[PDB]
């Protein structure tokens, strides 16, 4: 069932993901699409089925072989004041996923799976109020707080929702610290 | 020529380029649509359009009253290595648009126009190797670097394109500082 119309969808995933551009002989390494001759064909149509549309998004290609999915300058000058601002860095953002999932985690052991540099990312993080740091028996305990909870869409900021949701994430886009992970737990069990 | 395909491609890219969940009445003040009632029906259309179209983009409502242009499970699961992890804040970004359309520009103009949050800016983007300081009579000359244009989209590295290029960016986005650039502009033909 690995058919034409899913080696488009996947496309035109990658497309919305990446708002960067991409080359075909880029696209087809993550991709996995051999023929760069099938792989073009599917973004002109992608490209013209949007065309066709008259939709406020569109794909075409830009500098040296490359393919973007922008807004149209129509309508972006008209939502500039929707765009998100991110504050965060890929390190801290990837700490506080650690820290969501793990909660409530003792701050040593983030250190553990992240070296001196999550020490910084613990700080920035309470200073953006998105954890909290409860002091317990000499060390610190992790979670996110109230304003994590808003942000990402949990009113209920249920404590065991969140582990579950970020138990996803870890494993989808953190899979080398997954891992770190499992190999931890296997050791606490065999140490103790 | 206020149109009403005009107004629904205006909600379909504010859902593009927010990528967040958004209320009826939180697009109601941006996009400018007054009858609730009329700006849901285009989103219904929306989300329909794109679900005949079997497409891996989809646009769902998610917990109270808000709409969301994410990517589908199953392909969101797929390019999961095509996703941008960014190292600059907004404030960063922001400085960095600054010295892209003023440079040559000295440091202490930069500052001024910024305040002392410019001085781990300028430390932080130097350190990115996206802009460079060359030593000046006392004082540094900023300016984007080789790697700031391959990160970019010019391969050319003009620095006049590029001080083009981010007088759209500037005006756009940063309005205000666009006229603080205008004012301080007003005050050195004024002062001498």
Redesign the interface.
Known sequence: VDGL?EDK??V???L???????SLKELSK??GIKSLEYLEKLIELIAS?YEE?????EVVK???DKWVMQ??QE????????????????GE?KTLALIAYLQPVEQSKIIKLRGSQAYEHIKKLLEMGLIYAEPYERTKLLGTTQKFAELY?F?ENDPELIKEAFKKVIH??YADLMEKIEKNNRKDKREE
């Open positions: 119309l969808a996947l035109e995933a990658a919305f993901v990446a708002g960067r551009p991409l993550a991709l089925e549309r008259k939709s406020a998004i830009v500098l040296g807004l149209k309508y972006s000058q008209k939502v500039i004041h929707l765009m998100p601002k991110p504050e965060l860095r890929a953002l869409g009113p989808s886009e």
